[PDB]
């Protein structure tokens, strides 16, 4: 039986939170045709005690925090004692959102806050499934809100003023986002083999052609630009099991993490992957620069680097051969604990439309260590194929030797 | 005593010989620990350079000035009796000379026109201990001891003095630690059954360690404690480490506790320098002191999550004062220790009447059931700051409650506001059994 939870916190928004549930059941009702129940959670951290919500099924502030216990997610340090207080309760909410959706009908979930609030909100809410409603009346929702949406369908609703009582302007916002989320639901309860792509414009010649062969082998596929978030996007997709195969071309972004660029990948690079144990062919696409902008930016002991100004806003390093080592070493670390079958794909003339005879980046010495220690740390690894092409990444033959290769650890 | 005649090697040495205007290009080699000690030495070099250097300064153009033929300041200093100073001869040349006092002053010579002291100078503590330690150096080189040492991270109250203290073998070991009061206190709490276990001999201050090594007392200890290492050099601790002769170290540390300044003009300490290359690391996160409330403040001061044994929960309180006048004895009696931040403060206290006040910092490791902290100075108030480690300390020595008195807002106001309004059943979160 379908069940959608109306979440805030009532110790200072309890006429908003109300008023905003008793538009979504109305609206709920209303565009059915059919039942589904609405449940008052109560996310508040001070001692202020809320025991109800009108008629409401409702959740108290404590009952949240019961079904939890202090883990790592919450051990670190904070800058006051309300933003720590926030962060507990916002992981005891996904806990309690983690249950109702197993041994429930979680159909969708609804909030709203400040910057506070809203970062209560947004961390349990994309801790969900992609597809399951999710929605946040926010007063920052205009602003930098990465932190908050993340890689999820996490939607934020701009609340135009500050959110301080049921007036005349917030009684036409918190009406039109319940409308939508109920329209979310109930829509949502009355209703190919995907290959996932790295790619960066110094490789979109590469891409763009292996994607071009793929859907003519039959595939969908989905591209990510390899900003930090790409990866991770990407990797969020496989274990969310929209994506059964990839074809890592470019992984760019260790670079970025192990020199320290803007554009970085976290630790966890490449694990999803591998846990789902589908198909990975990869390979070092512009594993030849990190990523900085601009140049006033780029810290102080590499301003004596090799510098290529994309644009005022980015600025690119070319990667010494010291470096290309400590690359080859994150990326065998992760492929040497694979469990299923693993290709690794080398360009030998060069990884980026920068790194080839004639362009600023090109440096062969660069490759050819990046190369052999590939080889070497790979050469014990029973379940990876290491495969030494005398091409340039961006060559139409290096393309095609990607699909040949993904087609045979993924037969069809 | 003896002691002046082991600075000889300082006794009139030309200031210039002793300056060195740079230390900022030294690249250190070998293992991590041996470039800390190193530096440690450095660092010490530096502040004496630093010290000598500024008393040049004001002789050519706190900081006493002596003229040797009227035997009468031409600047007096703050202090008195200072160990040392730099002389300025009939000729003009600087020298820097061990003092010695009588009745009437500074001993001084037939070709000394003036002689310059400040606070740096009145402790001859860097030449003694760059005495002791470059004798401790085959070439520069320090020796590095084979000891196990086995650092254990704490938290206000988890049992770092009560380990070291329940852990000691007074007969065989070494406690060293920071500063006097805090020696004097270890001392005390290891001495209150009624007999004498702790003495001057196994229970010392760093500097006093360093400053009268081999000197006398004992040198060979089977176990070091080092109580509140965090406080300390890294290079430094590898010294003592290894001149305690111990087979393993124990050095209780706190991360939000005063740390280690550099306190020398862009002088070279970098990050990896400040990290202590150990052996082994133990975590502390379990107060046995602290309240609930208090625990949630030390849970966003410190890495990993913050326990308590404690059944208090909220325990603190604040009072916006209107009439400073009006905090006497007679008007209101503060209960529990009296404490507050400034000794100006604490001055004012005492004069009113109100008895055994100390300032936080006096009382840095000790407990108290209940405190009543007070801040009568409206003007700013440096130490007091969200982030300062006074402002830590002043929250975490009380196992009942805490009061705080004070003429003016501030980030001691909000903390306790915040800590008041903190959900009760978040604050349980923290409970663990004992
Ligand atoms: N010192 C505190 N300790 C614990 N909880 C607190 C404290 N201060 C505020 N809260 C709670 O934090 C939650 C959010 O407070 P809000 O005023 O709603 O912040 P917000 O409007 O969502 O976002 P901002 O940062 O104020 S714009 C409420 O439950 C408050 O009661
Ligand atoms: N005289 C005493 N009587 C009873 N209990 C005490 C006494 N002194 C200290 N304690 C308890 O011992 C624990 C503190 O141990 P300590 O080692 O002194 O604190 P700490 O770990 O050193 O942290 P610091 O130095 O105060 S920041 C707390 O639970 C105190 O309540
Ligand atoms: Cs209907
Ligand atoms: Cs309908
Ligand atoms: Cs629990
Ligand atoms: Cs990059
Ligand atoms: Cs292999
Ligand atoms: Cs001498
Ligand atoms: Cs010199
Ligand atoms: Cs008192
Ligand atoms: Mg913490
Ligand atoms: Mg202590």
């Known amino acids: ?412 | 005593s003896e002691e002046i005649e082991s600075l000889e090697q300082f006794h009139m040495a030309t200031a210039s010989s002793l300056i060195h205007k740079q230390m900022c290009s030294i690249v250190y080699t070998g293992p991590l620990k041996v470039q800390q000690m190193k530096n440690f030495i450095d660092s010490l070099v530096a502040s004496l350079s630093a010290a000598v250097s500024n008393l040049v300064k004001i002789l050519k153009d706190k900081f006493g000035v002596l003229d040797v033929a009227s035997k009468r300041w031409l600047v007096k200093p703050s202090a008195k009796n200072h160990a040392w100073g730099v002389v300025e001869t009939h000729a003009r040349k600087y020298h820097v000379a061990l003092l010695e006092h009588d009745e009437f002053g500074i001993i001084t010579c037939d070709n000394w026109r003036r002689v310059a002291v400040s606070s740096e100078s009145v402790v001859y503590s860097d030449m003694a201990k760059l005495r002791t330690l470059r004798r401790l150096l085959k070439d520069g080189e320090p020796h590095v001891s084979s000891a196990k040492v086995v650092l254990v991270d704490g938290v206000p109250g988890c049992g770092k003095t009560k380990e070291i203290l329940s852990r000691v073998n007074f007969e065989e070991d070494l406690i060293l630690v920071p500063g006097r009061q805090a020696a004097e206190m270890i001392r005390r709490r290891a001495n209150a059954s009624g007999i004498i276990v702790a003495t001057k001999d196994n229970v010392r201050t760093v500097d006093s360690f360093l400053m009268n090594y081999g000197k006398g007392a004992r040198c060979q200890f089977k176990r070091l404690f080092i109580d509140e290492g965090l406080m300390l050099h890294t290079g430094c601790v590898n010294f003592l480490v290894e001149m305690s002769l111990c087979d393993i170290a124990y050095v209780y540390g706190d991360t939000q506790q005063i740390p280690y300044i550099n306190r020398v003009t862009g002088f070279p300490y970098p990050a990896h320098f400040a990290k202590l290359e150990v052996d082994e690391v133990e975590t502390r996160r379990t107060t046995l002191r602290c309240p609930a409330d208090v625990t949630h403040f030390l849970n966003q001061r410190y890495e990993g999550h913050v326990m308590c044994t404690s059944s208090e929960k909220k325990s603190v309180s604040q009072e916006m004062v209107s009439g400073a006048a009006s905090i006497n004895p007679v008007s209101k009696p503060l209960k529990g220790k009296i404490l507050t931040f400034t000794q100006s403060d604490k001055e004012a206290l005492l004069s009113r009447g109100y008895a055994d006040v100390h300032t936080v910092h006096e009382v840095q490791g000790e407990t108290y059931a209940d405190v009543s902290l007070v801040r009568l100075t409206p003007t700013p108030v440096s130490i007091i700051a969200r982030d300062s480690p006074h402002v830590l300390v002043s929250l975490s020595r009380h196992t009942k409650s805490l009061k705080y008195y004070t003429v003016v807002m501030d980030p001691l106001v909000s903390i306790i506001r915040d800590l008041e309004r903190v959900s009760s059943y978040l604050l349980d979160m923290y409970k663990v059994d004992a």
Not at chain 1, 188 to 201: A, C, I, N, P, Q
């Open chain 1, 1 to 412: 039986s379908p069940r959608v939870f109306c979440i805030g916190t009532a110790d200072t928004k309890f006429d908003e939170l109300r008023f905003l549930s008793e538009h979504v059941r109305s609206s709920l009702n209303s565009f059915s045709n059919k039942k589904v129940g609405v449940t008052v959670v109560d996310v508040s951290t001070s001692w202020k005690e809320t025991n109800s919500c009108a008629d409401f099924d409702f959740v108290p502030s404590k009952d949240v925090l019961s079904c939890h216990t202090l883990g790592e997610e919450t051990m670190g340090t904070f800058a006051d004692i309300r933003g720590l207080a926030i962060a507990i309760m916002s992981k005891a909410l996904e806990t309690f959102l983690s249950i109702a959706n197993d041994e429930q009908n979680l159909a969708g979930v609804i909030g709203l806050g400040g910057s506070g609030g809203t970062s209560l909100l947004s961390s349990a809410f994309r801790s969900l499934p992609i597809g399951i409603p999710k929605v946040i009346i926010s007063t920052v929702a205009s602003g930098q809100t990465e932190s908050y949406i993340g890689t999820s369908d996490l939607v934020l609703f701009p609340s135009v003023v500050d959110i301080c009582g049921i007036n005349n302007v917030s009684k036409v916002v918190l009406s039109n986002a319940g409308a939508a989320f109920a329209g979310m639901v109930i829509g949502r309860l009355e209703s190919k083999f995907t290959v996932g792509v790295t790619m960066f414009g110094v490789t979109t010649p590469c891409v763009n052609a292996v994607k071009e062969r793929l859907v003519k082998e039959g595939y969908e596929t989905l591209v990510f630009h390899a900003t930090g978030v790409g990866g991770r996007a990407m990797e969020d997709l496989v274990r969310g099991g929209f994506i059964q195969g990839v074809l890592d071309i470019t992984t760019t972004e260790v670079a970025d993490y192990v020199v320290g660029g803007v554009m970085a990948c976290d630790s966890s690079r490449f694990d999803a992957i591998l846990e789902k144990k589908i198909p990975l062919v990869l390979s070092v696409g512009a594993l030849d620069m990190v990523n900085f902008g601009p140049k006033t930016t780029i810290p102080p002991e590499f301003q004596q680097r090799k510098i290529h100004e994309h644009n005022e806003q980015v600025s690119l390093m070319r990667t010494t051969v010291g470096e290309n080592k400590k690359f080859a070493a994150f990326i065998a670390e992760k492929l040497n604990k694979a469990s299923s079958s693993v290709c690794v794909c080398l360009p030998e003339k060069g990884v980026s439309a920068l790194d080839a005879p004639g362009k600023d980046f090109y440096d062969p010495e660069a490759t050819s260590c990046l190369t052999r220690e590939l080889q070497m740390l790979l050469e014990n690894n029973e379940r990876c194929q290491v495969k030494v092409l005398p091409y340039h990444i961006n060559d139409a033959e290096f393309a095609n030797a990607l699909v040949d290769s993904f087609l045979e650890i993924s037969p069809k």
